[PDB]
Ligand binder design. Sequence first.
Ligand SMILES: CC(C)(C)[C@H](NC(=O)C(F)(F)F)C(=O)N1C[C@H]2[C@@H]([C@H]1C(=O)N[C@H](C=N)C[C@@H]1CCNC1=O)C2(C)C
Ligand SMILES: CC(C)(C)[C@H](NC(=O)C(F)(F)F)C(=O)N1C[C@H]2[C@@H]([C@H]1C(=O)N[C@H](C=N)C[C@@H]1CCNC1=O)C2(C)C
Lengths: 297, 298
Amino acid sequence: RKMAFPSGKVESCMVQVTCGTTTLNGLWLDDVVYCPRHVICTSEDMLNPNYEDLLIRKSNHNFLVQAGNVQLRVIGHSMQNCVLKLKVDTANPKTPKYKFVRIQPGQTFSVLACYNGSPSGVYQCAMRPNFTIKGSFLNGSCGSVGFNIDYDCVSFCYMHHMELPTGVHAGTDLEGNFYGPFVDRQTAQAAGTDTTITVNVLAWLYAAVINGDRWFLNRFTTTLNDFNLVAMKYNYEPLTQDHVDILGPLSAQTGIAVLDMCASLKELLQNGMNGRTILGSALLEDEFTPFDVVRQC
Amino acid sequence: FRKMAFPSGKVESCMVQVTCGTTTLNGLWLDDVVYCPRHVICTSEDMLNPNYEDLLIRKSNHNFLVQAGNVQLRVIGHSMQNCVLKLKVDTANPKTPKYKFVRIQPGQTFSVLACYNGSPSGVYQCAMRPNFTIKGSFLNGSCGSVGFNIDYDCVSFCYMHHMELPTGVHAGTDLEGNFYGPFVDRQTAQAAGTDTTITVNVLAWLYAAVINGDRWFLNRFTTTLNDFNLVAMKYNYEPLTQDHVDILGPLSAQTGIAVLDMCASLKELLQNGMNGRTILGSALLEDEFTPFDVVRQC
Ligand SMILES: CC(C)(C)[C@H](NC(=O)C(F)(F)F)C(=O)N1C[C@H]2[C@@H]([C@H]1C(=O)N[C@H](C=N)C[C@@H]1CCNC1=O)C2(C)C
Ligand SMILES: CC(C)(C)[C@H](NC(=O)C(F)(F)F)C(=O)N1C[C@H]2[C@@H]([C@H]1C(=O)N[C@H](C=N)C[C@@H]1CCNC1=O)C2(C)C
């Protein structure tokens, strides 16, 4: 099953940021608050914003940053790509060890969905190959963040900005650079056709073998190039050299070579499951990374 | 539409490690009491057939090692309440949330904070099954992990983890130490009663699918409550009560689909199957979202 990281370290970093009547969420680390830059927009502004000109008309005293109902005075502001950095007069005493990372398609993370600076729920998400996430976000959720935790260190990888017409979600890394070709303007935008995350399907097949569900293992192997060309005919992502390497631990644990598992997946694509299940599922799951498999055990 | 858990921070601040002899598991530290599964006092041999009152009288306060992070909490008293041990410690938890202990009913959902050696590992959503098991994700050392819900800064603790059945589902207690289901904290093979599907939750999920634009399973037919329940019981679904119909009111109002209309859609799903189609990306009918869960997320 999907498991989110414990969210407590991130909960103590969530604040609300208001400009005029626009309120969204921000992330308070040390004495800086990070939030989506469209907080400075009026509803009419969002249709066609000039962020450089809009930010010129703003001063520190136009920004209301609150931890709960407690105001944190803003003493400086700057724009970095599509995020606003608000320097505040108080360093967050609950700042965790952290870093900012830009993730690849296929990688998973936990989202802490927040409204008015108040955490509401937590769930695991994957970055799709088309650079959207299949999230759960309502009005006011912008500035909610996605993250991973590794031994006391929080790696922030996503800040939420928008919802696309197909119901999927788009946002930035914590340096304000969008994942994908999207822009923070209220104008017609559309996600590209998506694909299946091959490396994660392979990880999930390894998990099935580890648990004794191994009927789909076949007696063939393939080359990575041959597999990549066939996979694309089924709307599956091609594998990178990095994908092969992150499957190494699971390949070692099961004694099933990566390219043997690739050949087994190829048969599943060309012939289906013939009514059978894998880990109880009739569908091939693609939002568990090799790291998620290892973490779950 | 995602299986969303409550933010776990308020509970993380309460998790500690409890050790007795060479048995280690998790405890929940609230004010000056640590609550944990009583089988922490058992050796490996004791667990095969424990007499807990006899085992407990032979322990002293100093046999219990409680660690909150790196700091040990001195145990100054102890008692047993059913299958839960209560350790009085000389230090009150400074981050004790507003909380209550509640016993939940089958079909209700809660968040689990899975912990190992007193340290939180992951958070996920579970339902209490009609047969009083839970389909959790728990490994060695997970005992004393808790399940909870949060309502406006108040934590309602409903579950503490004790054991895994041979089928791979899980059994535990409320925070008064009473098991959900006909199980006991003895290491011996135990089966649960045959499980059933949580009908009111399946209906809430079908409403979530319609809210999200997935309508292929709807039909023009309708049914009475009794005729729906006849088919539901035939397929090992729980009866739908009038209370359930009322609880679904907000979702019927939002979608403009009468509850008994949605029942007729579910009846055909049960009799015809999904024909290789999916609902909200699932090939099976999902029954671990309550109506409240759907309302909160949507
Ligand atoms: C769907 C909405 C049509 C209204 C619009 N979308 C498109 O214009 C697109 F279709 F082009 F994407 C859109 O998201 N926004 C319009 C305006 C901001 C953003 C926005 O309101 N963000 C919300 C943050 N609080 C989170 C949203 C709320 C609903 N669910 C979410 O996740 C910006 C791009 C500057
Ligand atoms: C599966 C195990 C066969 C070993 C046994 N099960 C049965 O004896 C049953 F069949 F009766 F359930 C069982 O769980 N235990 C044996 C012994 C305690 C409990 C136990 O080890 N609890 C663990 C807490 N740290 C959590 C477990 C570990 C694996 N996954 C879990 O969730 C007690 C009942 C006293």
